[PDB]
Amino acid sequence: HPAEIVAHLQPEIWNKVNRLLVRKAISEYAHEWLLEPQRLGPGETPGFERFRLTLADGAQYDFDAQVMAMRHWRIPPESIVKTVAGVPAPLDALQFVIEIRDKLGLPVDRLPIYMDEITSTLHGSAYKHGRTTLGAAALARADYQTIETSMIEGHPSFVANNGRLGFDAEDYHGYAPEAATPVRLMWLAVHKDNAHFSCLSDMDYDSLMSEELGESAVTDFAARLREQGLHPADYYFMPAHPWQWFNKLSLAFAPYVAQRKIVCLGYGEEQYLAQQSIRTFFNISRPGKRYVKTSLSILNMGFMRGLSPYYMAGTPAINEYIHDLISADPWLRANGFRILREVASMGFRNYYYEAAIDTDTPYKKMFSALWRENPLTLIAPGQNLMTMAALLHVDPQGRALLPELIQASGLDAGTWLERYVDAYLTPLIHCFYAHDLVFMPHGENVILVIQDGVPVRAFMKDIAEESSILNPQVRLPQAAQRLAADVPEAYKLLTIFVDVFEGYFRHLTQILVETELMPEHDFWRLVAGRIAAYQQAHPQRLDKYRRYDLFAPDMIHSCLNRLQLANPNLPNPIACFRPSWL
Amino acid sequence: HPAEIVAHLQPEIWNKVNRLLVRKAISEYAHEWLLEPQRLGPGETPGFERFRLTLADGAQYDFDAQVMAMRHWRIPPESIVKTVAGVPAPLDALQFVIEIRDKLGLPVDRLPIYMDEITSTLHGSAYKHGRTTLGAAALARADYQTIETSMIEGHPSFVANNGRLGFDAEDYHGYAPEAATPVRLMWLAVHKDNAHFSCLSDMDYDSLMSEELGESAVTDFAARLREQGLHPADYYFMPAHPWQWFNKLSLAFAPYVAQRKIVCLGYGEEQYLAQQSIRTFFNISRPGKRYVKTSLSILNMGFMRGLSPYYMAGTPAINEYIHDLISADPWLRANGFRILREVASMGFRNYYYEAAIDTDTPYKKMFSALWRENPLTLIAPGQNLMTMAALLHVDPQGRALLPELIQASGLDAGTWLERYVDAYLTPLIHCFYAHDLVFMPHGENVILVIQDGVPVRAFMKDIAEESSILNPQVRLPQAAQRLAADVPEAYKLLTIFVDVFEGYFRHLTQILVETELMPEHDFWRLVAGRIAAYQQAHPQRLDKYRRYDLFAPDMIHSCLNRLQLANPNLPNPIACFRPSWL
Numbered sequence A, B: 001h002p003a004e005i006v007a008h009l010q011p012e013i014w015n016k017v018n019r020l021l022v023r024k025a026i027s028e029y030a031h032e033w034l035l036e037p038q039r040l041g042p043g044e045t046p047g048f049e050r051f052r053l054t055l056a057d058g059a060q061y062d063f064d065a066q067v068m069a070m071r072h073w074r075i076p077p078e079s080i081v082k083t084v085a086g087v088p089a090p091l092d093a094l095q096f097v098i099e100i101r102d103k104l105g106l107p108v109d110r111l112p113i114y115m116d117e118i119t120s121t122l123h124g125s126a127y128k129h130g131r132t133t134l135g136a137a138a139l140a141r142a143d144y145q146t147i148e149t150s151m152i153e154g155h156p157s158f159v160a161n162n163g164r165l166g167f168d169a170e171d172y173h174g175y176a177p178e179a180a181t182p183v184r185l186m187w188l189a190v191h192k193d194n195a196h197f198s199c200l201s202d203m204d205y206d207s208l209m210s211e212e213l214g215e216s217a218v219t220d221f222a223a224r225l226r227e228q229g230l231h232p233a234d235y236y237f238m239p240a241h242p243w244q245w246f247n248k249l250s251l252a253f254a255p256y257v258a259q260r261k262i263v264c265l266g267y268g269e270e271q272y273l274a275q276q277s278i279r280t281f282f283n284i285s286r287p288g289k290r291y292v293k294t295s296l297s298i299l300n301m302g303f304m305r306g307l308s309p310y311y312m313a314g315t316p317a318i319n320e321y322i323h324d325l326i327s328a329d330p331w332l333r334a335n336g337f338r339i340l341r342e343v344a345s346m347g348f349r350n351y352y353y354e355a356a357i358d359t360d361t362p363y364k365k366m367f368s369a370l371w372r373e374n375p376l377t378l379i380a381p382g383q384n385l386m387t388m389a390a391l392l393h394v395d396p397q398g399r400a401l402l403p404e405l406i407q408a409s410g411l412d413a414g415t416w417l418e419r420y421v422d423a424y425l426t427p428l429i430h431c432f433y434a435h436d437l438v439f440m441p442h443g444e445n446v447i448l449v450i451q452d453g454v455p456v457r458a459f460m461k462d463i464a465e466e467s468s469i470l471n472p473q474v475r476l477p478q479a480a481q482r483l484a485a486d487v488p489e490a491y492k493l494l495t496i497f498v499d500v501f502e503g504y505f506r507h508l509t510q511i512l513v514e515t516e517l518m519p520e521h522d523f524w525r526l527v528a529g530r531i532a533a534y535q536q537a538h539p540q541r542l543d544k545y546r547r548y549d550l551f552a553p554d555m556i557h558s559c560l561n562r563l564q565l566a567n568p569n570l571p572n573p574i575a576c577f578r579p580s581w582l
């Protein structure tokens, strides 16, 4: 029945998730100064103030808030009360966006798209809150992929973060990460005139295919090419997201299909689960196998999710460089921090789009793939992996995962958080100061290695797209040259201030305070302490600690929601712990 | 197998259809002055000249052409020869568009979309040329729906005319008109707060539903609402294109589904065929039933194919007005020309999009429907119906339908064409002069009534969207007020010059000449003769014949392809037959 496809859309659960998204919208938009709530007096929850939002058409939102560090608006969702001209009304996230549309500054051309992203985020939220779920306590001790597929929030700062625009109602149940439906990849023969292969210096295409597909499947694919009168030597075998084949490649790449530059070989035998990034897949049929990342022409969280052939060309070289650098560094060796290498890549160039468009465009990015190192092969017996996003997880009953994980560990909050900070933040600090090396260290890019509830180290993924060496003097292999970047002095610490402090820790301390684990100031003292101890241990780079000052009175900050909608100072929470040598 | 979905994409058929689309591109772009072919000398076909297109990157296209009336480039497809820097290359329609991209003036933002429309037009062409088809001779005598689903060309002027962007590979085989796959409508209960119903003054919702669904199905739908604790009196029942439910309504209208303002009742029992407009459906389960036209959010030929709730409100009133006008006119009564009434309509207003966007937008147009009068109920026993597009039909073997139809009729070309002109053009002339009433009279809007191969009269559809009364002094019911329009004096004859002469007859005379039925000048003499005889018979409107001069030296003309790509004089082929009274 066509109705079953949205059976998760029911009035009561819809109201629940709209209330939660209005809370996030009020909090994040206020943080970015899109909203300026008016203080009414003490709030209806102890330690909170009562705030009001008055809109020009008679809508009024009253709520409780605590303004924490970095202008962070901590709001209890049940405290929010909407009245339209004095009459109480249900919280409606889409109405809220419309009511503040003058303040948002969306182009009238882009507003309906933003609205659809909000609606789709809500529909997913309804599905996620209504599905069979593990509670916080069980999830804290679950296996890697169970944790991965059980995440609810998405990116903690972006309001319209889970749109997946392009997935129809049936696509959702087959391909959305939270649906946890096994997926088989589509395999295609691609002509070498269009497809470019790259890999690590000690790998080749044959060895990759031998590990990934196996000789039997490879043999069959080649024999199927010969059978239809083609030369296997003229082709590589390349995986695609099945949605991408049906929706994009079969149609938009029709001339290549017709000319047999692309030949559809059908579904692989092995099954995968879509990861939180949607277009990346973990193999659930066999152990030790690489993730497969694919081009997927859906709009999610600011971007179409294709994969660039130009980027693919240098991806393995960039990863090899960074891996070697990390492996040769004795501080990093002792810490355990490391990357998951994008070991091989395939880019299919569409010369029609390339001839037509000189500029950067998603149209060039519809058909690429890469293979990423499996982290389970890197850890000790008994250890387990969890997406760092899990530390922010709150289950549909309102129970936080973090205190459960800390309880399970047997350690005090302080000791646990010190271990976490030295596993996650300190290596980022070291990579910055010692190597000018920066990543994108948000919850979906960081995998924590957990030992009896305790983070013992961290893995970073999403390397070649996001990483930079901030020193044009670095000597790189030609293929890896785009890694080198040069950023103004004022913005060098962007990845720590914006991506770690504002993008992740800001949300973490709300959880810490709500669950009574730790006051925000204690957390920031601890963070400052780890930074200062690192700097003390490596005094020879004082020039850099002074020039790029983590203890500056004000921090770099970004307005992520403003940036998405488009296409003052923020005091630094560790400034008061500034060490003497600065 | 995922490969079967594009089994129609094979090298040889791909080359065939690309050659045909390059012919159309060269002809239409040249007609609009986007191209200016250089004459080399006499052509390689008798009566043709040889022309060259030189592009700045070494591509050269030589071809034979005859420049007919209205700067019409008649080109034999096999005469076209592409050389890239002296080396012969296959004709590739997408490459051709790219090669002339400087001349087209596409925004760099809109070019990739245009390219996709070209590619999808080609993929459809490949399917259409490769499918099981009737030959021209059989099609000339086939039933209405067989003719409808067997059309190949599409709009004869637009190069990128059959994109259907949004239909994936599987959607194509289920929903494209040429796939001729029976479709069942999706039925939804829609809340009266959002859904507005309109119909003819002597109809009501209950009688419409009684005729269309029947009491049994209506009863069941209402009982299903009550069963789930809703009041049937709060809802109408409304049909949708199933693609629209899965891709747009279930997701983008999620808040309404969640709030139960939209309730999916499932597929209807009756089966339909998609007409050439894609979103309009003819009932193939029962006789006498109305067409159902639906909102479908795909991009085709310049426009997203939704259906406006604002337009729906006055649609039946506009149709009732025009029908009554035609019925009261004794000239039209004697001729037989008439409209197929859009008798009832339903518009679902999405108040989120309406609150957010003040301007005209496709987002407001995603959920509407109307019902259109069935023409089979209006004709005599033994007569048959055919889309006027059929007169331009050429089968995959290169055989034209028109000479077969004329041969079947027993009449000479001249006599046959005189009957056709008096069935089609003369009533348009009368409607203009006597009533200031204009339509959009292209091949897909006109249905010919055929009697033993002879057109005896014509039906016009697509009324409320396209028609105007060009006289603000007309007294209309309030609901029908938007019918009245006021156009500058110089552009009043647009619908005849642009839509009939340039848009349809221009293509017709190529067929007439190619098939040796009639020289173009004989055709234009005949047309002029029908016009002059009409004017002679109604001398009292001479003021209007002088003011809006069908015999002016130059005609109104439009560059349709330029207009689509964006978002000199053209001599009038009947100017030399100007009657004495002008």
Ligand SMILES: Nc1ncnc2c1ncn2[C@@H]1O[C@H](COP(=O)(O)OP(=O)(O)OP(=O)(O)O)[C@@H](O)[C@H]1O
Pocket (backbone or CB within 6 Å): A153, A154, A155, A156, A161, A162, A275, A276, A277, A278, A279, A280, A293, A300, A301, A305, A389, A440, A442, A443, A444, A445, A461, A462, A465
């Ligand atoms: N907690 C989270 N933090 C950040 N992004 C998240 C989170 N949960 C889900 N996501 C989604 O993951 C994607 C992150 O974007 P990013 O560019 O980092 O990854 P990617 O390049 O798409 O894939 P991968 O990380 O597999 O290489 C976005 O689609 C985002 O919406």
Ligand SMILES: Nc1ncnc2c1ncn2[C@@H]1O[C@H](COP(=O)(O)OP(=O)(O)OP(=O)(O)O)[C@@H](O)[C@H]1O
Pocket (backbone or CB within 6 Å): B153, B154, B155, B156, B161, B162, B275, B276, B277, B278, B279, B280, B293, B300, B301, B305, B389, B440, B442, B443, B444, B445, B461, B462, B465
């Ligand atoms: N020979 C043809 N002439 C004009 N349009 C055609 C032809 N064949 C197919 N079409 C398609 O039919 C549609 C014509 O557009 P138009 O606005 O006249 O109709 P509509 O409002 O979509 O539907 P209907 O005519 O059913 O009311 C376009 O999608 C066009 O591509």
Ligand SMILES: [Mg+2]
Pocket (backbone or CB within 6 Å): A277, A444, A445, A461, A462
């Ligand atoms: Mg990532």
Ligand SMILES: [Mg+2]
Pocket (backbone or CB within 6 Å): A462, A465, A466
């Ligand atoms: Mg990335």
Ligand SMILES: [Mg+2]
Pocket (backbone or CB within 6 Å): B277, B444, B445, B461, B462
């Ligand atoms: Mg029409």
Ligand SMILES: [Mg+2]
Pocket (backbone or CB within 6 Å): B462, B465, B466
């Ligand atoms: Mg129309």
